[PDB]
Amino acid sequence: ARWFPKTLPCDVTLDVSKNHVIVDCTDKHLTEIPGGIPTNTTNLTLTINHIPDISPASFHRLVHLVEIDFRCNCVPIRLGSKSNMCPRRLQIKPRSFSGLTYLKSLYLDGNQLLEIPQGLPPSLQLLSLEANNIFSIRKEQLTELANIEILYLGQNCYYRNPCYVSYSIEKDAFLNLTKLKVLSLKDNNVTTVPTVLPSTLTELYLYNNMIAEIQEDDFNNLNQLQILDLSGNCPRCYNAPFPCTPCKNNSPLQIPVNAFDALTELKVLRLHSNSLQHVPPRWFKNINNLQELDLSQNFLAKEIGDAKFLHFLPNLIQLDLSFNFELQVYRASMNLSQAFSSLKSLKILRIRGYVFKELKSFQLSPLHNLQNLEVLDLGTNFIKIANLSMFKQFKRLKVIDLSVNKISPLYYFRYDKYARSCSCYKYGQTLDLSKNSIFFIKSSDFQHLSFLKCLNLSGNLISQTLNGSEFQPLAELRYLDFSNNRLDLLHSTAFEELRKLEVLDISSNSHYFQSEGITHMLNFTKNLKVLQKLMMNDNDISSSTSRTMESESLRTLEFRGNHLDVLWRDGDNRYLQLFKNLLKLEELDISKNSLSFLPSGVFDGMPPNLKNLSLAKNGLKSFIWEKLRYLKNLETLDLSHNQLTTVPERLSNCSRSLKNLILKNNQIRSLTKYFLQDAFQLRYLDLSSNKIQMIQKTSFPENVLNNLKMLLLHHNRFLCTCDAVWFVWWVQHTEVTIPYLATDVTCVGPGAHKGQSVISLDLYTCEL
Amino acid sequence: ARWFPKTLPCDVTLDVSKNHVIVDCTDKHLTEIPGGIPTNTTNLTLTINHIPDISPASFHRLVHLVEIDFRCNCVPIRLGSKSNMCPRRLQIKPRSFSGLTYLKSLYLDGNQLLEIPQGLPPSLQLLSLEANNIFSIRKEQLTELANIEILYLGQNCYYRNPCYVSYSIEKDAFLNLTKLKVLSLKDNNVTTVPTVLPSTLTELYLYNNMIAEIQEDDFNNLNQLQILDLSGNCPRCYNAPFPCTPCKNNSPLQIPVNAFDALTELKVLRLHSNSLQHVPPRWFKNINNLQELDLSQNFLAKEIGDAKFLHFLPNLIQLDLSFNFELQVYRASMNLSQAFSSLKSLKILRIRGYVFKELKSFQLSPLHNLQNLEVLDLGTNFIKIANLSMFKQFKRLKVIDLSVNKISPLYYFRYDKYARSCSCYKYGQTLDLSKNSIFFIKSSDFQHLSFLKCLNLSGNLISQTLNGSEFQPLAELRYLDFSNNRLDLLHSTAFEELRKLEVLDISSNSHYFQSEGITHMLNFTKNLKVLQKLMMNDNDISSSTSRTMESESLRTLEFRGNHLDVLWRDGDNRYLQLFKNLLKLEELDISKNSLSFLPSGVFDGMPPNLKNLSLAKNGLKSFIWEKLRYLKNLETLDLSHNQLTTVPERLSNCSRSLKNLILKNNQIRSLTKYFLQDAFQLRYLDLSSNKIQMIQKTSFPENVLNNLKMLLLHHNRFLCTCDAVWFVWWVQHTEVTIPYLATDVTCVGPGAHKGQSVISLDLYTCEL
Ligand SMILES: *[C@@H]1O[C@H](CO)[C@@H](O[C@@H]2O[C@H](CO)[C@@H](O[C@@H]3O[C@H](CO)[C@@H](O)[C@H](O)[C@@H]3O)[C@H](O)[C@H]2NC(C)=O)[C@H](O)[C@H]1NC(C)=O
Ligand SMILES: CCCCNc1nc(N)nc2cn(Cc3ccc(CNC4CCC4)cc3OC)nc12
Ligand SMILES: CCCCNc1nc(N)nc2cn(Cc3ccc(CNC4CCC4)cc3OC)nc12
Ligand SMILES: *[C@@H]1O[C@H](CO)[C@@H](O[C@@H]2O[C@H](CO)[C@@H](O)[C@H](O)[C@H]2NC(C)=O)[C@H](O)[C@H]1NC(C)=O
Ligand SMILES: *[C@@H]1O[C@H](CO)[C@@H](O[C@@H]2O[C@H](CO)[C@@H](O)[C@H](O)[C@H]2NC(C)=O)[C@H](O)[C@H]1NC(C)=O
Ligand SMILES: *[C@@H]1O[C@H](CO)[C@@H](O[C@@H]2O[C@H](CO)[C@@H](O)[C@H](O)[C@H]2NC(C)=O)[C@H](O)[C@H]1NC(C)=O
Ligand SMILES: *[C@@H]1O[C@H](CO)[C@@H](O)[C@H](O)[C@H]1NC(C)=O
Ligand SMILES: *[C@@H]1O[C@H](CO)[C@@H](O)[C@H](O)[C@H]1NC(C)=O
Ligand SMILES: *[C@@H]1O[C@H](CO)[C@@H](O)[C@H](O)[C@H]1NC(C)=O
Ligand SMILES: *[C@@H]1O[C@H](CO)[C@@H](O)[C@H](O)[C@H]1NC(C)=O
Ligand SMILES: *[C@@H]1O[C@H](CO)[C@@H](O)[C@H](O)[C@H]1NC(C)=O
Ligand SMILES: *[C@@H]1O[C@H](CO)[C@@H](O)[C@H](O)[C@H]1NC(C)=O
Ligand SMILES: *[C@@H]1O[C@H](CO)[C@@H](O)[C@H](O)[C@H]1NC(C)=O
Ligand SMILES: *[C@@H]1O[C@H](CO)[C@@H](O)[C@H](O)[C@H]1NC(C)=O
């Protein structure tokens, strides 16, 4: 019971520990900075709005501001919305920030600014001006930034935001920024490394530029540098999904052998897409502490078979040599140099896109005694042959990734993976064979792999009648992803040899379920004694040879994207107890099953401990709410995206345990007279995207409403007449969380009130 | 144009040739028969409504009625809607039909009637009472039906509409119906064939009943019978998708060897699902003219290898022996008796669900000299091996169907396929291998099959880099369905050996398009010199190695379900001419491509003769209508299911050629002042399912409206005030075809008019 309603269209959080008062106005369709922002505001976010200008009046009384995030109020045309394009660039008048003596962070990215804003306070530590039109850096324009530590200037001149000229940086522009630690000049059309840079730099990003050559002294004074990224300078442009201009004569980025001598603290070196043909060992002479090295998207296929530089990297943790294939060559094998054995600290090795026909055990011998190796990624290599038993010498690994290959019996190609916008590994040893050509499996294929905990066979070509003998050696397996295959459940003994199986995914195996009159033994679960979760989504199941699925252990069943409407055809009672004997089942997802109605017997046929039931996206037109009495343990009921027109007369007379009721996206036009009357257990109600006009106190008693963790009412058809007097007052003065109050909890009428938020509604004429 | 607007909620057609006045009130949510039905009405349909009763007032003036179709006004609970269930059965008071002296047809199906309606006129020839609760036939209740020719009484006692007792038919109930030709007692729980039936019967349907035995004299007097169906009496219940009770001791339907002796005119005999183990030749002794024989869903696997009865069927056109497999037996081969060679007239032979491992050439030798054979269907047999070259001896066939098998290098199971509700074959010789396990193809696989015109490899496991050598022998092929495979377009020479290919379907081959950084040669079309149509739907294409697709012959390209939003990413101009060099292209479907906007250059990049463009289901939020000037041959533009808010100021100034404009399912709230001014080529406009409130005369000039073949305005937000005076009058008096006028061209306001049809609107108060 608030005494003064909050009409400000921003979320106001109070973090009393750090004295911070956070005002978040992100994406509120604002054309001006709203009035009434708290005077003690420390963090103000006005991101994704259409405020055309900043002036001394903008933050006049907000003297305690430590951060202003004013991003994307005039986003460049190619990066922004075409339905609501920005007409003019953001105008910043003088003395807008100079009075803010506590300002530490200022983000003005994506506003089409032509110059670095001046009159900034001396307390500023972070300045961000990405995706603007600033492509000439002058020393006089950086004088104000004396105490700056982090400076983002990238994305001011590239294909999604062109400047039509080379980027210019005056000599020693950044040299006297004595506290500068992070400098990013990525995606800027830069032609040379700016010199002299301040020796305090810890991170330097110069990737996706036009730097053809590094001078031997470009990084001579950067003895504190930890991260250096020169990627995308002389890029490898074959199959580039973005406009890509390589260096002439197919030349690499020219780096002198002594260019990194001063970088004794370097931990990360990124040389992705630099068209490199050799990696001279001399580069890493003085770099002893290097931990991450990205050499992907170069022409290093031959170098991988020699790689003498690896002898100088005993502390390297991560090495990436992906997409170094030679065009038009299909190598018979992967030639890894013996030098890989000197990478004592290596945890992750990635060599995708090398392109070779057959993987043999001895080709991985240089990796055999790398004691800290955790990930070996050889995906996207068009490997046709691989004896999986070779991985018996790789039991210590966490993931063996052979995904996207031809084995049978956006990251590397995105322009800027760090661009700013406006899984079974946890089970243990994983062998990922997903998106391969395995059409048939036999026990001998998995010999010597009894240590595996997860096997991903998703997206293979397996059209087999499994009988419980195919995975016999996989005694420790806990997770089997068999999705996107053609499983034929002729035998109820399928998967029974996987005695420790906890999760089975057989989703998207619709092939044999789509053809009429063939056997489907859905009772196969009875033999899996420790199975906790079963997924059989998108199988188009409309028939079954077994009338009951049984399990003493299963807790979760996902059965979405099937045809329970056909199995439960009215007059056919045979499958109304299909899930009844899944005695420990707690979660059942039967959404997207074309259930326009539920026959009588479905609720009585549910297993006894059912907690979360989803009947979403079914086209449900009616629902006998009283039948929820059968589900004595129901806590969550999802009826979203259906065609329901009513709520129960008494929700308490339907379920004594229901905590979360989701009714969003239905056709509800009104609530029953005593809907939530005495439903004291309800903690979450979603009635959003319905057609409710009125809500009276009898339907929504305050003794129930105040207990709610959340109440969603947005996108309804609220009629703001004098009959809505209680609802409007309650919404304005309630502590109960209701999202979208200042953006989509609106009056649709009458007249004057059409389109008006109920939070700003004044109904004084109703009490004269 | 019209002086008296039509306010009747039914469609009224006038067929002056056959002298009919057709009034169709189907599915109009009627609770009473509407007043003002034309007195000359001959055919009155009131199907799917909620009219609770019929009385002498119902058809008082309609003396010229020849047909009353009053079906499904009180559909049985298990067959009808659960959101709007019928409360009480249809009440028919006396003298409702007795005055209709020209009534020839009366359909009262699905109304929960308890007895055969009495007081029917003597002119009645067809009476239909399916899906009612009439399960006792008495001779006295049939005396009124003296001139009846067709009588449907089925579906009155079965699992979807139970009666809880056996069906009763009095002795000789139908005997004195001297003109009865068709009698259907299907799905009725009948225990014996009713006798004596009138000798004038041409068709008798007794399927899906509890008849365990046929007496030798049950059909002794039926010398005019052409169709006899006794299916589903002692059914084969393995994998039945409906409640199925077999005859005890697994006994078949017992048919004496001489039961069909009087049926000299029998053309169709259906013995589907009768658990038959033998087919005695003696059954067909006096049946010389039999044309169709259905013996599917029996236990005739052994009989197929003997089948001496086939020697007595030289005129048989269609033979079905599907789903006769022995449970738990996987035969090595198909044993077809040599007796099949005596089926001289056979055109269609179906033997699905026989279940055998290997198909060999000599197993089909009994079929070699059957000169009229057109269809050989061996689908759903779990065949693992088959030399496709064997079909060189079957060049005369139209279709060889091996669909749903395991070959590698609802019809038979529906309860009642004739239940009443309330393709490349045209190219020539087709070989259907769809839904098989072919993972790799080579030229030799298709040796001796140069005669084929269509090959369906849809839904196989082909993950190959085709290079133009795999289909070398298929010189005459015109249609290749390669959908639902894993095509890898590494080579632009794929499919080039198919020199006569007119249609290529490579839809749903998304596998290799979903993985980043691999080659995709979309320029492969250049080599296909007579290709007319290319389908590459649902491939998730977001990248391409070729910037242009080329073709001198292609007329139709389907590219729906891809990611042109990614290929045409703003700032990337490389693929804006992807379709430009498809010089003869007339139809382009680029719907479902996530195109929230179209970058500049898309329209200029279109090929010159483009006539039909679909941009449906894209989430398009804006559209520069002026760019249609580039498409000088555009005739059809589909912009349905998008988020457009406006129409062009003057459509004629955007396109001089546009004839069909589809804007249904958008967010349009108003039309421009002169929208259709001088749009002389416009013939079809769909503005349905938008949010239009008002339409003024200026937007819709009469010289343009009079050329429209159709104008769709339904499901809008029409505001029926005095400002809508022109629109309301025009809708009422126009001759332009506007569908859904009496069901979904409604006022949403103000007050009194909410929910009212604009056709029934009286605005006389606006002119006083
Ligand atoms: C087709 O006709 C048969 C009879 O020829 C109908 O079956 C009969 O149905 C009734 C009602 O379901 C059965 O009676 C009940 O039996 C149970 C069990 O003994 C008893 O507890 C009840 O009090 C009641 O007496 C009757 O036994 C059963 N007869 C046979 C021989 O099965 C059948 O329902 C009809 N089909 C349809 C679809 O209406
Ligand atoms: C990781 C990036 C992959 C890009 N390349 C690829 N994209 C796609 N789609 N498929 C590919 C399959 N392969 C293997 C391959 C390589 C070279 C040659 C041709 N060499 C012969 C000429 C004389 C020797 C044939 C090959 O396979 C049949 N590379 C592929
Ligand atoms: C047309 C309806 C098909 C119904 N049956 C079927 N439903 C489904 N899903 N898959 C099937 C695969 N097959 C072939 C088959 C038949 C019998 C036996 C068992 N016999 C062996 C004991 C010694 C011989 C094994 C078989 O394959 C492994 N029939 C199947
Ligand atoms: C309010 O602004 C301050 C200052 O810009 C933010 O402080 C940063 O918090 C992160 C952790 O989230 C630290 O890693 C940084 O070192 C802090 N920066 C400075 C300069 O102190 C703070 O996070 C902002 N709060 C919110 C919620 O926006
Ligand atoms: C990067 O800088 C180059 C120049 O170094 C820009 O290229 C020039 O662009 C103009 C306008 O298109 C042309 O008239 C010149 O001929 C180009 N010069 C050269 C050498 O190519 C380029 O546009 C800049 N990049 C971006 C994305 O703006
Ligand atoms: C109007 O009713 C007559 C009589 O019921 C229908 O006539 C049938 O037309 C079909 C198709 O030509 C014939 O096969 C039937 O034999 C005719 N029946 C009789 C009894 O003559 C006519 O089709 C109905 N018209 C419409 C459009 O409903
Ligand atoms: C591996 O590659 C190197 C060159 O990179 C070559 O010297 C060596 O002989 C190759 N060995 C094998 C086994 O291919
Ligand atoms: C696979 O390798 C194992 C050794 O780990 C060996 O026993 C087995 O025979 C090999 N099989 C094949 C097909 O090479
Ligand atoms: C298996 O791999 C697919 C990708 O091919 C991925 O979507 C899925 O999450 C993986 N399974 C698990 C359990 O990690
Ligand atoms: C399962 O099939 C394999 C051959 O694939 C066979 O060795 C095994 O005996 C079968 N299992 C049973 C229970 O017959
Ligand atoms: C599944 O049901 C069949 C009968 O249809 C039975 O033979 C089989 O043992 C059942 N399987 C399990 C694991 O209960
Ligand atoms: C689904 O049930 C699990 C317990 O089985 C619970 O952790 C989860 O919160 C439930 N989902 C919701 C939305 O409450
Ligand atoms: C609870 O609901 C049932 C069904 O609607 C009804 O019969 C019962 O009377 C209700 N309780 C009360 C107190 O009326
Ligand atoms: C074919 O089946 C019949 C019995 O139906 C048997 O007499 C005959 O020997 C069988 N021949 C072959 C080749 O299987």
Ligand SMILES: *[C@@H]1O[C@H](CO)[C@@H](O)[C@H](O)[C@H]1NC(C)=O
């Ligand atoms: C397939 O049959 C043809 C005869 O038409 C023969 O030439 C060919 O060798 C056979 N192929 C195989 C794989 O047996």
Ligand SMILES: *[C@@H]1O[C@H](CO)[C@@H](O)[C@H](O)[C@H]1NC(C)=O
């Ligand atoms: C190929 O078969 C599939 C069914 O497997 C069918 O949907 C498709 O229409 C067939 N292709 C043609 C061109 O008839």
Ligand SMILES: *[C@@H]1O[C@H](CO)[C@@H](O)[C@H](O)[C@H]1NC(C)=O
């Ligand atoms: C295409 O593949 C076949 C089969 O591997 C091969 O014989 C043929 O030489 C290939 N074509 C070319 C042009 O390499």
Ligand SMILES: *[C@@H]1O[C@H](CO)[C@@H](O)[C@H](O)[C@H]1NC(C)=O
């Ligand atoms: C497709 O383009 C490639 C170059 O990217 C070229 O080698 C090939 O000949 C082209 N194919 C056709 C059929 O034009």
Ligand SMILES: *[C@@H]1O[C@H](CO)[C@@H](O)[C@H](O)[C@H]1NC(C)=O
């Ligand atoms: C126009 O082309 C579309 C496909 O883009 C097609 O579905 C439609 O039937 C065509 N209409 C006419 C009148 O040609």
Ligand SMILES: *[C@@H]1O[C@H](CO)[C@@H](O)[C@H](O)[C@H]1NC(C)=O
């Ligand atoms: C559009 O209308 C203007 C004004 O009448 C005219 O100048 C122009 O030529 C027209 N363009 C087209 C494409 O009809």
